[PDB]
Amino acid sequence: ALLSFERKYRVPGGTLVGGNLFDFWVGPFYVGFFGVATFFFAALGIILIAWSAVLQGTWNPQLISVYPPALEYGLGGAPLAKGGLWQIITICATGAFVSWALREVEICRKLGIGYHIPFAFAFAILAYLTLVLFRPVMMGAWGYAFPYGIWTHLDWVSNTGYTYGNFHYNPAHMIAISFFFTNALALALHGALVLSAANPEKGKEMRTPDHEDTFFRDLVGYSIGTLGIHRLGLLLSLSAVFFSALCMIITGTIWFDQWVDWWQWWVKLPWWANIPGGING
Amino acid sequence: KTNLRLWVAFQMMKGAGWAGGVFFGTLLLIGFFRVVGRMLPIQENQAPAPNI
Amino acid sequence: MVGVTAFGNFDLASLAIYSFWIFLAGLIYYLQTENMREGYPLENEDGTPAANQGPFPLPKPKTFILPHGRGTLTVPGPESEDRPIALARTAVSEGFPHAPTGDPMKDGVGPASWVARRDLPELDGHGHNKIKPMKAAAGFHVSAGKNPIGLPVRGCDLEIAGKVVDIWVDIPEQMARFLEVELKDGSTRLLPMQMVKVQSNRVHVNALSSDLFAGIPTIKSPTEVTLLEEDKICGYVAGGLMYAAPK
Amino acid sequence: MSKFYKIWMIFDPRRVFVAQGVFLFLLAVMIHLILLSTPSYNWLEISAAKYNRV
Amino acid sequence: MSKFYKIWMIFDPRRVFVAQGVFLFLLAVMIHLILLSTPSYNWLEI
Amino acid sequence: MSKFYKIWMIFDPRRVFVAQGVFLFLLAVMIHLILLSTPSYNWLEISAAKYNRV
Amino acid sequence: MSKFYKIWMIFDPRRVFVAQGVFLFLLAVMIHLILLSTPSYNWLEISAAKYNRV
Amino acid sequence: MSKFYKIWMIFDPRRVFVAQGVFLFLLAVMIHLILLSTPSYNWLEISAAKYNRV
Amino acid sequence: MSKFYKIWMIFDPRRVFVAQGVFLFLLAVMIHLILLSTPSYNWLEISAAKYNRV
Amino acid sequence: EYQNIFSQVQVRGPADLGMTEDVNLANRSGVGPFSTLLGWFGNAQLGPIYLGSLGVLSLFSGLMWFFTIGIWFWYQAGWNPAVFLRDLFFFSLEPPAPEYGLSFAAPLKEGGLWLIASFFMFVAVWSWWGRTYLRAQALGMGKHTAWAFLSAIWLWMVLGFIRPILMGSWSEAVPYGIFSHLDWTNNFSLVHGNLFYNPFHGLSIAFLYGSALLFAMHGATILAVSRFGGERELEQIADRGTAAERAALFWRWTMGFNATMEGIHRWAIWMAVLVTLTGGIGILLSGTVVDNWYVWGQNHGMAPL
Amino acid sequence: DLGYTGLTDEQAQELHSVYMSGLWLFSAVAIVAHLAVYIWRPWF
Amino acid sequence: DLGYTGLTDEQAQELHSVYMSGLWLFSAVAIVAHLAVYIWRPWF
Amino acid sequence: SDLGYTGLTDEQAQELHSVYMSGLWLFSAVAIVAHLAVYIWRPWF
Amino acid sequence: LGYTGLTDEQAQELHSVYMSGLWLFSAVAIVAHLAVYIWRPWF
Numbered sequence A: 001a002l003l004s005f006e007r008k009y010r011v012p013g014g015t016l017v018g019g020n021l022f023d024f025w026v027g028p029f030y031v032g033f034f035g036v037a038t039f040f041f042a043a044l045g046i047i048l049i050a051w052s053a054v055l056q057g058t059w060n061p062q063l064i065s066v067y068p069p070a071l072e073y074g075l076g077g078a079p080l081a082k083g084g085l086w087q088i089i090t091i092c093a094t095g096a097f098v099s100w101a102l103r104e105v106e107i108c109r110k111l112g113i114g115y116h117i118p119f120a121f122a123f124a125i126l127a128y129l130t131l132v133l134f135r136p137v138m139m140g141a142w143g144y145a146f147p148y149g150i151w152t153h154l155d156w157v158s159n160t161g162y163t164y165g166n167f168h169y170n171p172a173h174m175i176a177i178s179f180f181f182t183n184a185l186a187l188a189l190h191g192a193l194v195l196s197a198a199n200p201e202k203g204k205e206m207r208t209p210d211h212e213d214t215f216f217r218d219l220v221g222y223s224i225g226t227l228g229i230h231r232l233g234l235l236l237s238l239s240a241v242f243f244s245a246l247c248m249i250i251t252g253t254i255w256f257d258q259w260v261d262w263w264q265w266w267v268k269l270p271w272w273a274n275i276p277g278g279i280n281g
Numbered sequence B: 001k002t003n004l005r006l007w008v009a010f011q012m013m014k015g016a017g018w019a020g021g022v023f024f025g026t027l028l029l030i031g032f033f034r035v036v037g038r039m040l041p042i043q044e045n046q047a048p049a050p051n052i
Numbered sequence C: 001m002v003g004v005t006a007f008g009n010f011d012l013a014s015l016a017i018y019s020f021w022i023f024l025a026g027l028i029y030y031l032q033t034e035n036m037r038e039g040y041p042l043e044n045e046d047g048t049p050a051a052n053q054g055p056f057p058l059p060k061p062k063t064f065i066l067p068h069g070r071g072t073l074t075v076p077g078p079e080s081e082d083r084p085i086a087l088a089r090t091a092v093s094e095g096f097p098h099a100p101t102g103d104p105m106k107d108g109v110g111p112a113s114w115v116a117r118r119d120l121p122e123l124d125g126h127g128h129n130k131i132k133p134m135k136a137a138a139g140f141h142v143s144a145g146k147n148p149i150g151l152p153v154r155g156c157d158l159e160i161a162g163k164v165v166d167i168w169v170d171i172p173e174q175m176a177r178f179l180e181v182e183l184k185d186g187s188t189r190l191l192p193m194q195m196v197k198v199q200s201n202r203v204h205v206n207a208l209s210s211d212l213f214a215g216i217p218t219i220k221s222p223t224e225v226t227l228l229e230e231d232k233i234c235g236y237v238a239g240g241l242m243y244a245a246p247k
Numbered sequence D, F, G, H, I: 001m002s003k004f005y006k007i008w009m010i011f012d013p014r015r016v017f018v019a020q021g022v023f024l025f026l027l028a029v030m031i032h033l034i035l036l037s038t039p040s041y042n043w044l045e046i047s048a049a050k051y052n053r054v
Numbered sequence E: 001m002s003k004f005y006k007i008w009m010i011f012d013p014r015r016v017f018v019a020q021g022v023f024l025f026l027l028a029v030m031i032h033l034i035l036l037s038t039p040s041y042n043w044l045e046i
Numbered sequence J: 001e002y003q004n005i006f007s008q009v010q011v012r013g014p015a016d017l018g019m020t021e022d023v024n025l026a027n028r029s030g031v032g033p034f035s036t037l038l039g040w041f042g043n044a045q046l047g048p049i050y051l052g053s054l055g056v057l058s059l060f061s062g063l064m065w066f067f068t069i070g071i072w073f074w075y076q077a078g079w080n081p082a083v084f085l086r087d088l089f090f091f092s093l094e095p096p097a098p099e100y101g102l103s104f105a106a107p108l109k110e111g112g113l114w115l116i117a118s119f120f121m122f123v124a125v126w127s128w129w130g131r132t133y134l135r136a137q138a139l140g141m142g143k144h145t146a147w148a149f150l151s152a153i154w155l156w157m158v159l160g161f162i163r164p165i166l167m168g169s170w171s172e173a174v175p176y177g178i179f180s181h182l183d184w185t186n187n188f189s190l191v192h193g194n195l196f197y198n199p200f201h202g203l204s205i206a207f208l209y210g211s212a213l214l215f216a217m218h219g220a221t222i223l224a225v226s227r228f229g230g231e232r233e234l235e236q237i238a239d240r241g242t243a244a245e246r247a248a249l250f251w252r253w254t255m256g257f258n259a260t261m262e263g264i265h266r267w268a269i270w271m272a273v274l275v276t277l278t279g280g281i282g283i284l285l286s287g288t289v290v291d292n293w294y295v296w297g298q299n300h301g302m303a304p305l
Numbered sequence K, L: 001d002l003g004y005t006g007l008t009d010e011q012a013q014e015l016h017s018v019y020m021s022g023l024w025l026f027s028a029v030a031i032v033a034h035l036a037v038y039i040w041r042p043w044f
Numbered sequence M: 001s002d003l004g005y006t007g008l009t010d011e012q013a014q015e016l017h018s019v020y021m022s023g024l025w026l027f028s029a030v031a032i033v034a035h036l037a038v039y040i041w042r043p044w045f
Numbered sequence N: 001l002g003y004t005g006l007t008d009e010q011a012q013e014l015h016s017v018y019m020s021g022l023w024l025f026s027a028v029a030i031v032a033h034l035a036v037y038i039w040r041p042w043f
């Protein structure tokens, strides 16, 4: 049931809504007010995905797809069999995500730790709402959101990207990709370094943080530190998600053409625009 | 107790008012996005349907 | 090899994907068992071994050789709290909170908890103390921030509780770790640097009211701090967030 | 049959009541949405067709 | 309904009242939205 | 078979009860959904066809 | 074969029981789904054809 | 080859038994799926042709 | 030649045995799949053609 | 209110020259300058850096690769600095044309210079890998960094060396340019059906998203328990403190299971090496085993028939 | 008496009486609203 | 004799009696609702 | 001996199993009646 | 090599009950297969 050290931490407090009501654990899980809300919303969304599979006529989990309303419904309601199930599932998903974040806040303040984790999760919630709520509302139809299918939302990604030609000419998209790649590289390096210090050559003592600093200074001439590497990890992940949200929010709203055509402002700059040579001349 | 009736009503209203504030705040945010998209030239340039 | 199938629709891509599913299941098993080296076996709320322990067996012990002759650590191993817990059950059934019997901040339970870590200071790669007061550190000075030395310290009740006397510095990382605060009675306490906000004219401690500063655990040696003392100080200051909400 | 009251020797009523409320509300919402999905038993469309509202 | 008042010896009434207000408001909003999506009963449209 | 009661010496009754309840509910929902997927056992559409409701 | 009982000296009975229950349920579900995928063993469609229900 | 028993002085029987069970089950499933994928040796389709069930 | 037993004082038998087992199984599976994807050595199809199972 | 994102007080002392386990100290440099800007976020100290035989080899080869591409770019600009700055991101060293196969007879302008640059890059990358291994070995540490780098090298080798050989043509390889290798990526997806329906492509994307997820979770967790000295994880592994227990209990009460202060780093290293490993496999299978991934998905229950 | 909440029997009875008064008022308002809607636009 | 929740035998009996009263009230309401729906629009 | 991992005695296990079997047989009887009704209404064999 | 803390008698008794359960499960499965094979043989 409990970990060897868990008992002294399970104390009555830290709730946002309610009091001793909902202030208990079910197995390992803590279930506050927002635990109840999360469970209800998640279960309803999953059963509605299953019922949409029933209506669709497929039981292959890779072929199940819940499509948004067609463009002719605009931002209004749609019949359940045609677009309404997607809307109810979207509401359930938003409720589940927000209740999960608030439940994390309750757990954080019961344990006395900072609220870094719910904030970081709120970043991902905002990216999801950008794709499913804000961009469809600005573009004026629920039909611009993506469907709930394992391989059909990839079709949404492909169609949306190829509407504007090659999509990785979008500049905020380039920044987001660079952040994602740097994040994966930093995660690999950090995990490898801590493991290499804690698991040295056979028969040796554990290495110290001095050895980690020394290793990176020998390798690349700089060490960011331990606090530094964790700050950098949080910031790289959040920056990647923020720039992805930005590059999608500006895509069908401010920009309307090929992004490669966007990159021509630099080439057509007056003081080299007509010099005859190279690629663009 | 009349004070008891008022206290139960106040608790109900506190819960209902917080739920209403959150719901209406979400609606106000949606209206903000709807308005800023109304001021944009989306109508002139409409994207095709991504879902097929 | 384009279109070469051994049976059905099974080609090198299908073979690769199924091999990867098998590999991924094995890798997840390995990662979970490696994570199971602390806190197990699972216990009942009365301390006895729980009936249930889980789908993953406990891993074989491995030993760490600690530096500077500090000994060895073998995990998984017999783990005991080695301190009294002043908590009482609020319910006979499991899954309910345990209420503190006395003052939670003095007793060190809940968000004010601490662990019985080693009673020795943390060392650096060369064997010296990792954390030193900036006065005892040689050549250390404040470089580019607001220097907190001499600033008054304000608690969460907007009342002055003391003044900053020194800064305790992590020598290998070259970062400030603690603020040393002198109280009204001429006694000094350590405050975690991550729990204070250094302003233009003051240092503000949101977690702790002015009267609670005297209750911070003290260090038995003015020149060094051990791991156990660090646990007590950090746990006390953090427990102030929940247990000093009024005033 | 007559000894079913001992289920409260196993489960504290507070968590049981929370779980039962969640389960019953979820089940009722499920069934109502399932009925609303079908062209028959969609009482709103049935009424619209019956009274020629269109 | 003879002894239903003992529910208040199981759950704290303040918390129950607040949670019940939240539940009732959310249920009313859900039903109103379901009505609005239908071409009939859309009182805003008419 | 006369000693099947010792499973309660092996397994804690309340964890078994929770897991069994979840399993039974999910199994029942699975079977009902499978029946609703079949055109010849979707009782809602069977009743729609029988009473000529379109 | 007369000493197969010592596997309970090797393996803890309750972990084996949980794993065995999960394995048996998943195996049964797999076989039933395989049969339902086959047109000549989908008993629901076999009954639909036999009693002429469309 | 008589003293193959000394393998258990090298390999923990608990790990070997689990690994062997996983290996044997996966191998059996793989071979059965190979046979089902072959138009001959698919016993379900063989019987469907033999008894004119299509 | 007769001193090949000296290898067991350089490699510990556990790692060698595990590595050898994994290697042998993977090699055998790869060879079988290579033969199975070759029309001239696919024994299932050879048997199908020999006995006219089409 | 203090979130521990930026340091509020910065201190400096004598520079830390580093450990001397059995590193050859004659191959180290002096310490560089301290930077306040970097010290706001992490450490201020720059250097020293170790330079050895493999450092020299990697630097020479990487500099030659960079200079070869740069001189080709200057040639494409017509030696005009204005055109060089305008059409930067548009220049590209291309691999030999498809009709040359794997041969080395392609002219300098038509792909021979690409082969020279590729050879220099090959030497630079492999000598840097050896350097990571040897720097780990000198300090007595495990070689985890070398193996993670080996995963990255696997994907790089498949893209540039292994797959072109199996396809029988250097024209399959990636060109050296900013926009040109993006164009190569897009055309690679278009030629082979739809790379979204490559299952190992999907796994690679799953592990890239998972790296972002796990790194955000872990950075947030360590910053949240940094008030208890949770950033000093190497000591929390040896002597568990309240920081590690609070982090474990947060994740246990949230999602039902937790990690340790070392197991989380095992999760981290595997989550990253898996994106690169699965990506390498997925690219290797494209064109050599599957020519049209969408049709493959249709035949494997992933797309509607 | 279980008494998880600290209420006595009389306190629970009084609280339930007031709660039921409120519930019946809410239900009466809802019934009138449904009657008005059904007269205006029946759904059966 | 067996105890996991701290309830005695009489407490469990009383709680179960009230719970069954509530369950039968809920079931009676559901039965009336199903009878009304089946008369209005049978599904068999 | 007991072998118990759960702390139940022999009598406690017997009583718990008796009540559990009563519940199981009630559930099974209801399921049997439901299947009989469905099979009469619409047989699947 | 106790490995679980069970004695010899405890292992024997547990295995006896386990085998009773296994044979009951197998008998039910055998009857089910006989019914299916009579209804619709697969050989």
Ligand SMILES: CCCCCCCCCCCCCCCCCC(=O)OC[C@H](COP(=O)([O-])OCC(O)COP(=O)([O-])OC[C@@H](COC(=O)CCCCCCCCCCCCCCCCC)OC(=O)CCCCCCCCCCCCCCCCC)OC(=O)CCCCCCCCCCCCCCCCC
Residues within 6 Å of the ligand: A195, A199, A200, A201, A202, C015, C016, C019, C020, C022, C023, C024, C025, C026, C027, C030, J141, J142, J143, J144, J147, J148, J150, J151, J154, J266, J269, J270, J273, J277, J281
């Ligand atoms: C076939 C499918 C099914 C297979 C099996 C299925 C059965 C069930 C699953 C079983 C698998 C479970 C895996 C869990 C292992 C746990 C590993 C671990 O983290 O720590 C334990 C252990 C040591 O732990 P430790 O306590 O930290 O030790 C510290 C030491 O004290 C001091 O430190 P140290 O010096 O000892 O080094 C520490 C390091 C030690 O780790 C290593 O030694 C790794 C060695 C390199 C990998 C081998 C391939 C390299 C290319 C071949 C050329 C050289 C061969 C290797 C040379 C060996 C020399 C020693 O340990 C680590 O923790 C490393 C963490 C990250 C490793 C990342 C490895 C990246 C490999 C890049 C691949 C490049 C080519 C790929 C080609 C395509 C392959 C599909 O490390 C290992 O055992 C590493 C395992 C390496 C696995 C390689 C990946 C295999 C990819 C196959 C994918 C499936 C096939 C899909 C396609 C199929 C097509 C048909």
Ligand code: BCL
Residues within 6 Å of the ligand: A157, A181, A184, J125, J152, J153, J155, J156, J159, J184, J185, J186, J187, J188, J189, J194, J195, J196, J200, J201, J204, J205, J208, J275, J276, J278, J279, J280, J282, J283
């Ligand atoms: C139209 C474009 C196509 C497409 C075409 C491709 C192709 C083609 C490839 C990918 C690949 C990848 N794609 Mg894709 N991709 C598309 C859409 C997506 C989407 C999306 C939301 O739509 C996402 C998230 C991704 C994501 C991904 C990554 C998971 C993956 C690359 C792993 C990586 O880290 O590589 C970056 C890391 C490396 C290349 C390793 C580099 C290692 C070397 C050693 C570094 C040496 C440095 C060198 C010496 C320079 C020195 C610098 C100085 C030292 C400073 N793609 C669509 C469908 N994608 C790759 C893959 O693996 O696919 C299976 C790949 O090859």
Ligand SMILES: COC(C)(C)C/C=C/C(C)=C/C=C/C(C)=C/C=C/C(C)=C/C=C/C=C(C)/C=C/C=C(\C)CC/C=C(\C)CCC=C(C)C
Residues within 6 Å of the ligand: D003, D004, D005, D006, D007, D008, D009, D010, F024, F027, F030, F031, F034, G025, G028, G029, G030, G032, G033, L002, M012, M015, M016, M019, M020, M022, M023, M024, M027
């Ligand atoms: C794809 O395949 C398909 C779906 C088509 C078909 C597959 C079918 C197969 C795979 C499904 C298999 C299902 C399993 C095998 C069914 C098992 C059912 C049994 C396990 C259900 C038993 C339920 C028993 C419950 C109802 C008992 C309840 C007892 C009372 C509620 C409480 C009694 C407990 C007492 C009070 C304990 C306290 C007493 C002590 C003294 C305190």
Ligand SMILES: COC(C)(C)C/C=C/C(C)=C/C=C/C(C)=C/C=C/C(C)=C/C=C/C=C(C)/C=C/C=C(\C)CC/C=C(\C)CCC=C(C)C
Residues within 6 Å of the ligand: D024, D027, D030, D031, D034, E003, E004, E006, E007, E009, E010, F025, F028, F029, F032, F033, K001, K002, K003, L011, L014, L015, L016, L018, L019, L020, L021, L022, L023, L026
């Ligand atoms: C897709 O499949 C579909 C959806 C189509 C069909 C599938 C259907 C199946 C899967 C659904 C299964 C449903 C379940 C099994 C139905 C069970 C219903 C029962 C469990 C409901 C019981 C309700 C009991 C409640 C109403 C009791 C309430 C009592 C309160 C009113 C007062 C109690 C207060 C007492 C206890 C206080 C005691 C304290 C003092 C001190 C004694």
Ligand SMILES: COC(C)(C)C/C=C/C(C)=C/C=C/C(C)=C/C=C/C(C)=C/C=C/C=C(C)/C=C/C=C(\C)CC/C=C(\C)CCC=C(C)C
Residues within 6 Å of the ligand: F003, F004, F005, F006, F007, F009, F010, G024, G027, G030, G031, G034, H025, H028, H029, H032, H033, M002, M003, N013, N014, N017, N018, N020, N021, N022, N025
């Ligand atoms: C693709 O391939 C297809 C699917 C077509 C075909 C593949 C088929 C093959 C791969 C499937 C292989 C399946 C395996 C080999 C089947 C094995 C079945 C056996 C292992 C099932 C045995 C079950 C035994 C259970 C029913 C026993 C239960 C006993 C009672 C429930 C409890 C007894 C325990 C007592 C109480 C312990 C306590 C006593 C002590 C004294 C306290």
Ligand SMILES: [Fe+2]
Residues within 6 Å of the ligand: A190, A194, A230, J218, J222, J233
């Ligand atoms: Fe870390």
